[PDB]
Amino acid sequence: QIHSRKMNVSPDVNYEELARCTDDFNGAQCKAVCVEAGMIALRRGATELTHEDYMEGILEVQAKKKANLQYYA
């Protein structure tokens, strides 16, 4: 909420959903999603933010780490 203060944010942003979805982050990584979710909003040209932007911002950090090791059923 602090790093999002300096930008134009739509006020319909639930911090329950944000605190629930953010797991094992720090202040650097919570800042990093907030920068990315704004730049994702810069790509589509909207002047506001939603929970969809931050979930996309979270997934852009690790860039969807998933390797099916294929041994495991």
Partner: protein, 356 residues
């Protein structure tokens, strides 16, 4: 016989009668030194010879105490050691020699497959130059410097040229070793000269190639007697901020080593965005094969997917090397075109000699 700098008398015959006598007794002799530091409201300048001693002398009344900074070759009296008119290193056109402003012979299609970073370089370069509207209305400052990093020859020079012909206005390439000079305090003046004479004209692009040499490498851990790369590095981080109140000209750096990283550069106001380049998956490789075959005589019935399957880990300089080597196989016999098996040997020659 000897020469001793002679000439036939038609140009110096009139010079040698009374002009030599006026260059002796009126014209004095000065020396050059270096300037360590200075003081405030009073000169009290400390000057070293590096061969004699360190002297604490004063300037003359011929110059004003305005441009005399730390590290400038100044004129030194023989008796009172007073500071005469300082001398500049080199004049004048050292900016045009790296700013050709010329249309490069690079097609926009010459980089195929990794288009995601090219669109990133489209947004960072082209949009604050020509579409500065959404940056104002929403409330994010546009970035003005991006570092590039990753494996060498991945397309660093290719993508940096892809934006060069894209707008065709004031492209400046800086060689990283060109700023590694011999004199004490030589590049930091040139960095001042580059930054002022680029801010005069609008829509300008400056690229820093191979910042492993001067762009924050080891900051000062190996050079403990010269201190030139650091002073230039301290100067460029000094002149980048402060002396940029809402500019237009973009500055890009590229490195191979992902270690020479200043956190003071990643302070917000100098460098904000991370854009790296990665290896092609399948098709970005095959595109480069399609690039480096169309200019030479090859068979029209051969494919390029099979060659890239034999090369898991490869860069464009390696792919160019195979085409030149498979080029040489066709020259070994009397073949005026290139056949597939010459490419197959060149894969096995390049890869299976040292790589794996």
């Amino acid at each position: 016989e000897s020469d001793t700098g002679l000439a036939p008398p038609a140009l110096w015959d009139l010079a040698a009668d009374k002009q030599t006598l006026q260059s002796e007794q009126p014209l004095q002799v000065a020396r050059c030194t270096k300037i360590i530091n200075a003081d405030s409201e009073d000169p009290k300048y400390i000057i070293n010879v590096k061969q004699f001693a360190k002297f604490v002398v004063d300037l003359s009344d011929q110059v004003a105490p305005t441009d005399i900074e730390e590290g400038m070759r100044v004129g030194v009296d023989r008796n009172k050691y007073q500071i005469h008119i300082p001398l500049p290193p080199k004049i004048d056109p050292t900016v045009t020699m790296m700013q050709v402003e010329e249309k490069p012979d690079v097609t926009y299609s010459d980089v195929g497959g990794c288009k995601e970073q090219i669109e990133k370089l489209r947004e960072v370069v082209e949009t604050p130059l020509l579409h500065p509207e959404r940056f104002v209305n929403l409330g994010i400052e546009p970035p003005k410097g991006v570092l590039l990093f990753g494996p060498p020859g991945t397309g660093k020079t290719l993508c940096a040229r892809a934006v060069a012909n894209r707008t065709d206005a004031c492209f400046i390439r800086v060689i990283g070793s060109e700023l590694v000079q011999k004199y004490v305090g030589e590049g930091a003046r040139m960095v001042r000269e580059l930054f002022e004479m680029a801010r005069t004209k609008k829509a300008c692009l400056i690229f820093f190639d191979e910042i492993d040499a001067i762009g924050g490498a080891r900051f000062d851990d190996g050079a403990g007697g010269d201190n030139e790369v650091q002073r230039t590095m301290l100067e460029l981080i000094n002149q980048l901020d402060g002396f940029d109140p809402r500019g237009n000209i973009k500055v890009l750096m590229a490195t191979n080593r992902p270690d020479t990283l200043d956190p003071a550069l990643m302070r917000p106001g100098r460098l904000d965005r991370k854009i790296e380049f990665s290896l092609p998956d399948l098709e970005g490789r095959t595109h480069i094969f399609k690039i480096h075959a169309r200019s030479m005589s090859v068979e029209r019935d051969i494919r390029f997917e099979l060659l890239a399957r034999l090369c898991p880990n490869s860069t464009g300089a390696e792919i160019r090397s195979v085409c030149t080597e498979a080029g040489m196989f066709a020259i070994r016999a009397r073949r005026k075109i290139a056949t597939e098996k010459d490419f197959l040997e060149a894969v096995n020659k390049v890869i299976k000699s040292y790589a794996k």
